[PDB]
Design a protein around this nucleic acid. Structure first.
Lengths: 48, 50, 162
RNA sequence: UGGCGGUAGCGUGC
DNA sequence: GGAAGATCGAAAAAAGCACGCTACCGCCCGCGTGGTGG
DNA sequence: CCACCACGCGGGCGGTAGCGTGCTTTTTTCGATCTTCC
C-alpha cells in the first residue's frame, strides 16, 4: 500500500522517495521493456 | 616445495595464470596479460610508492 | 578469427560509443527504425535505434581486448551470460542485417481513429477519437460532447495515450 | 516538525 | 583393479556485533532532451 | 545561434581500468586423497 511507502513532502517542492518506490519503478521499467522487446520479436540473446 | 606445487613452467603460462586470477571471465592473451603485469607494479601511474 | 559480440550502451550515448568504437577500428551494427511515430512530432519519420541500448560489435579479441571495448566512452557494459562475454552466432547477425522491414507498432500512436484520454477540464477521465496529425509541435483531437463529436487543436502533451 | 549516513558527547563497579 | 562411499581439511559464504538520550553537518536522482527566450 | 528552465526514462562509475586490503563463529561445499571394497 502507498502509505507503507509514503512520499515525504519536502520544502521547495521536492519529494523524498523511499527505496521501495525506486525498486518498484526499476521493476516496472524492466518489465515494460521486456514486454516491448517481446512484442518486437527480438533475437534470442536480447530477450534472454 | 613451492616450485613443486607450481603448475606453471614458463613466463607465458605464469602471466596467463596471473591475468586469469586478476580478471576472471575475460579471455586471457599474451598482450593483455603482459600489459596488466607491467602496469600492476611497474607503472608510475597505477603504482606509486611514496 | 573476428567474432561478434553484443553490448549494452549508456542512456542516450549510442552515437558517441559508435564513433569511439569506429575510431578503435571495430565493426559496429545497430538496427535502425525510421517508420516510428511519437507524440513529440516534428516530422516523426526519423531514424531511431531499434532494440534500444544494444550494439553489435565485430572484432578479434587478440587485436583489441574486450576490456578496451568495455571502457570506450559510452559502452555501459557487455552482455555476459556467465563469466565470459556472450558470442552471438553469425547466422543471427546475417538475419538481422536484412531482417528490418520497418515496424508499424509504436509506443505512442498519433494515428487517426485511436482513442485518447483527456486529463484536464471537464473532459478529464474521458476518451476521444483522433482526427488527423496536423502540425508538428501538436496534434488535434476530436472532443466528444454528448450531443456530437467535434474536432479541435490541442497541445501534444495536453492529451494522454489511452 | 519526516527520515537515512557521518561526526562528537552523556549515563553505565565505584 | 577401477568405482563408490568416507572423510578431511581447506576454502567460501552468511550473520552478529548492549540500552536509552543529546547536538551538528550532508542528502533525500539526474541527465539528456525539448521549449523558449534573448 | 547560445543559454536557462521544464520533463520524462533508465540504473556502478567512469573509463579508451580498476576500485578491496585491522573479526569471530557457524554452516556449506569441494578438491583431494583414501580406502575399501566385489
Amino acid at each position: 500500500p502507498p502509505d507503507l511507502r509514503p512520499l515525504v513532502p519536502l520544502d521547495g517542492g521536492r519529494f523524498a522517495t523511499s527505496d521501495l518506490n525506486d525498486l518498484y519503478r526499476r521493476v516496472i521499467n524492466r518489465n515494460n521493456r521486456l514486454k516491448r522487446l517481446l512484442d518486437l520479436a527480438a533475437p534470442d540473446i536480447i530477450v534472454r | 616445495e613451492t616450485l613443486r606445487v607450481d603448475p606453471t613452467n614458463d613466463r607465458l603460462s605464469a602471466l596467463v595464470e596471473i591475468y586469469r586470477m586478476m580478471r576472471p571471465g575475460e579471455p586471457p592473451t599474451r598482450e593483455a596479460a603482459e600489459s596488466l603485469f607491467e602496469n600492476l607494479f611497474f607503472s608510475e601511474d597505477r603504482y606509486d610508492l611514496s | 578469427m573476428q567474432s561478434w559480440y553484443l553490448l549494452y550502451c549508456k542512456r542516450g550515448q549510442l552515437q558517441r560509443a559508435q564513433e569511439h568504437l569506429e575510431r578503435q577500428a571495430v565493426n559496429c551494427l545497430a538496427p535502425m527504425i525510421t517508420l516510428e511515430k511519437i507524440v513529440r512530432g516534428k516530422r516523426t519519420a526519423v531514424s531511431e535505434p531499434l532494440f534500444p541500448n544494444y550494439l553489435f560489435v565485430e572484432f578479434d579479441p587478440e587485436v583489441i581486448h574486450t576490456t578496451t571495448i568495455n571502457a570506450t566512452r559510452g559502452v555501459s557494459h557487455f552482455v555476459r551470460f556467465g563469466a565470459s562475454p556472450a558470442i552471438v552466432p553469425s547466422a543471427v547477425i546475417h538475419q538481422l542485417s536484412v531482417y528490418k522491414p520497418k515496424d508499424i507498432v509504436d509506443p505512442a500512436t498519433p494515428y487517426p481513429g485511436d482513442k485518447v484520454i483527456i486529463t484536464e477540464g471537464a473532459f478529464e477521465g474521458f476518451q476521444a477519437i483522433f482526427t488527423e496529425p496536423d502540425g508538428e509541435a501538436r496534434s488535434m483531437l476530436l472532443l466528444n460532447l454528448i450531443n456530437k463529436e467535434i474536432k479541435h487543436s490541442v497541445k501534444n502533451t495536453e492529451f494522454r495515450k489511452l
